[PDB]
Design a protein around this nucleic acid. Structure first.
Ligand SMILES: Nc1ncnc2c1ncn2[C@@H]1O[C@H](CSCC[C@H](N)C(=O)O)[C@@H](O)[C@H]1O
Lengths: 61, 118, 235, 58, 25, 72
RNA sequence: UGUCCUACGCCGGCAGGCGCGGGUAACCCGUUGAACCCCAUUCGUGAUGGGGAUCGGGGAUUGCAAUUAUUCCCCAUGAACGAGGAAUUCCCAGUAAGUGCGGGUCAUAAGCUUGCGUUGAUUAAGUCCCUGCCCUUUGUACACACCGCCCGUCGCU
């Protein structure tokens, strides 16, 4: 199910070429859950994302 | 669908290998496409192929009028080699079906290309 | 920049790409002389009828070249649009739709020769999580060594985007029993550098002493034309 | 700069194949004569066939 | 510490890098 | 394949134009040319003739794009 | 930028020809009436009014001399080319790109190289995956080096 969630903290540039951004995300519908995600594109604090599969939390070193 | 092409076919699925051949045939409409006749091609592919495969495949395709044994020669028997030319190289099953014997997988020959995917 | 980066070959090779492929003069000309080089690169004897595989057939202009030389062939491909425009081209041979990396569905001891044109480079990268290029290449190459006649030949044309693709392809080929090598046609050229993996199923002594005395830090005579030179015969 | 680029791209290719060879032996069992000194290209000879390269597979 | 090495090994370095790129009268 | 757009009004084509063009909700040369299989210059001429008889409403005029639509 | 730049008058359809003025120059070309752009007409998916190569005829101009076409003009011919399997170039804002105009080379080219203005963006504000170069630590992995196998069989002088 489509679930929407807001960016609180961008954790940094990840990926081999720096193509992705690791970011800290909290949900609006339940503003208690917190997840870590990888995004493509320019992200600043306050961006709200639409997640198709909001179960797994992404990871890169 | 060329007859030699089906009768060299096997099943590329992992379990039944390499005993997946021969594939069972069925035809709903058959066409004849003109193909050039080099008798050396037929004379070299006749020793290559199992002939009981021809018997079972033609019985699947309703057809009986084939030679029953390996017809080996120096390309001197024009009537025999012409019959195998018509049957193998010219008879095409443009629309048809294929059933895998040892796995049961279904392959529709749909104008005139069978799909053989996962 | 390159077709491989588009994704899986079932999605980059859609109907629009097929219609741009069939109406492309450079594609026709280059892939035609590549089919010529491919058929000339395996030493199948002259005036001898042979049975061939033409995998990565796409349009079948490689198959049209094989049928032009009198030889019959079986086409195998993954994209339906390529097979649709190939049957629209009224090619002589028989086609088949199926992924090559899963395995070629043919009985062993079958084909006199194999020709692959611009297709083996697509098995070097994984576009699905279930996909693994190493095992896929191993399976596809083992399927070649199975379905081919022992002692037949297989030419495998490619444009490797780096040496890692060549490394993995050659390792998976040599671990499937294949014996052969690489014909790199026009190696130092750029517009004609084409990779074809071809496969088949079976006085000094005094100088040293003076350098010793130089390293030891003492005065040494200058090294000249007359360093080691026999002054006279000794009676 | 593009010269050294291309040259040691080729050198990396050769080194990678040469380092492929020993584990290939373990787990299991190039146009230099056609290089033109005057220019980048590929010059034909009469004694030998058209320019090529043979790297055999082990 | 071991906790610091594990956390710093599973996180991403961020921040420091500067790129030098590029009236009244 | 090769289009065979008519260079001039046929009788049936002219009748079908006169009784099917004035109810389309969008009148441009391109749509009449594509769905009547006619050459676009004569499509423009037919649209100008239909405007001249006071039956179709022009919306905007340009050298690049001209658009008409129904009166009501 | 200019003692070859040129205003203007007359002739020829055009290249061009004749005459008469200005300019050693923010003084004259020159309020540099540029092209893209803008506004109307024709065209209608057609290797077609797209594209111009290559040719046939004639005219004009610079040169001692234009043949193997110096250059330009007019009429005719309308080839390949349908967005390039594949190797790669440059680039982060008045920028790329589209578009014209100047300077040097020059009796005549355009054909390089330098500049100028006009219209005006897509992406990006990161990285060390490829390449270059600079560091630091190290010489423990691999390679080298060391040892071992160093191929066997008969046949005559
Ligand atoms: N794994 C795979 N299995 C089968 N076909 C594949 C494949 N990966 C790529 N291909 C095929 O490779 C082709 C590349 S285009 C080749 C066209 C052909 N050489 C010609 O010009 O006649 C496509 O038709 C694509 O479907």
């Amino acid at each position: 199910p489509i679930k929407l969630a807001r960016v609180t903290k961008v954790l940094g540039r990840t990926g081999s070429q720096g193509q992705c951004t690791q970011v800290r995300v909290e949900f609006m519908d339940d503003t208690s859950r917190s997840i870590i995600r990888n995004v493509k594109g320019p992200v600043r604090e306050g961006d709200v994302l639409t997640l198709l599969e909001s179960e797994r939390e992404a990871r890169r070193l | 669908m060329k007859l030699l092409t089906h009768n060299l076919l096997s099943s590329h699925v992992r379990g039944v290998g390499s005993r997946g051949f021969p594939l069972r045939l069925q035809a709903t409409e058959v066409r004849i496409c003109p193909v050039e006749f080099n008798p050396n091609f037929v004379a070299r592919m006749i020793p290559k192929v199992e002939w009981s495969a021809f018997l079972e495949a033609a019985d699947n395709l309703r057809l009986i009028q084939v030679p029953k044994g390996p017809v080996e020669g120096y390309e001197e028997n024009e009537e025999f080699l012409r019959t195998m030319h018509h049957l193998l190289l010219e008879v095409e099953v443009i629309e048809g079906t294929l059933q895998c014997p040892e796995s049961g997988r279904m392959f529709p020959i749909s104008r005139g290309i069978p799909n053989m995917l996962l | 920049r390159r077709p491989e980066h588009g994704g899986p070959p079932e999605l980059f090779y859609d109907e629009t790409e097929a219609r741009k492929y069939v109406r492309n003069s450079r594609m026709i000309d280059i892939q035609t002389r590549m089919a010529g080089r491919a058929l000339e690169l395996l030493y199948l004897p002259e005036n001898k009828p042979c049975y061939l595989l033409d995998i990565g057939c796409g349009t079948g202009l490689s198959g049209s070249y094989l049928s032009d030389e009198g030889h019959y062939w079986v086409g195998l491909d993954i994209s339906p649009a390529m097979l649709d425009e190939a049957v629209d081209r009224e090619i002589e041979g028989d086609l088949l739709l199926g992924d090559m990396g899963q395995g070629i569905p043919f009985k062993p001891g079958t084909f006199d020769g194999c020709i692959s044109i611009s297709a083996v480079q697509w098995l070097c990268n994984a576009n699905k999580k279930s996909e693994n290029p190493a095992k896929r290449l191993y399976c596809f190459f083992a399927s070649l060594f199975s379905v081919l006649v022992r002692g037949s030949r297989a030419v495998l044309q490619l444009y490797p985007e780096n040496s890692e693709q060549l490394e993995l392809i050659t390792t998976q080929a040599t671990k499937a029993g294949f014996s052969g090598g690489m014909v790199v046609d026009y190696p130092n050229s750029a517009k004609a550098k084409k990779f074809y993996l071809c496969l088949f199923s079976g006085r000094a002594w005094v100088l040293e002493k003076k350098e010793r005395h130089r390293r030891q830090g003492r005065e040494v005579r200058p090294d000249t034309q007359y360093t080691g030179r026999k002054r006279k015969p000794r009676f | 700069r593009n010269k050294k680029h291309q040259k040691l791209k080729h050198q990396k290719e050769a080194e990678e194949e040469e380092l492929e060879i020993p584990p290939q032996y373990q787990a299991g069992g190039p146009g230099a004569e056609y290089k033109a000194k005057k220019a980048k290209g590929d010059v034909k000879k009469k004694g030998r066939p058209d320019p090529y390269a043979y790297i055999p597979l082990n | 510490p071991l906790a610091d090495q594990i956390l710093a090994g599973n996180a991403v370095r961020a921040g420091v890098r500067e790129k030098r790129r590029g009236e009244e009268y | 394949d090769k289009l065979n757009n008519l260079v001039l009004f046929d009788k049936a084509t002219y009748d079908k134009l006169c009784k099917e063009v004035p109810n389309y909700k969008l009148i441009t040369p391109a749509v009449v040319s594509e769905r009547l299989k006619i050459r676009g210059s004569l499509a423009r001429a037919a649209l100008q003739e239909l405007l001249s008889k006071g039956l179709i409403k022009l919306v905007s005029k340009h050298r690049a794009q001209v658009i008409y639509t129904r009166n009501t």
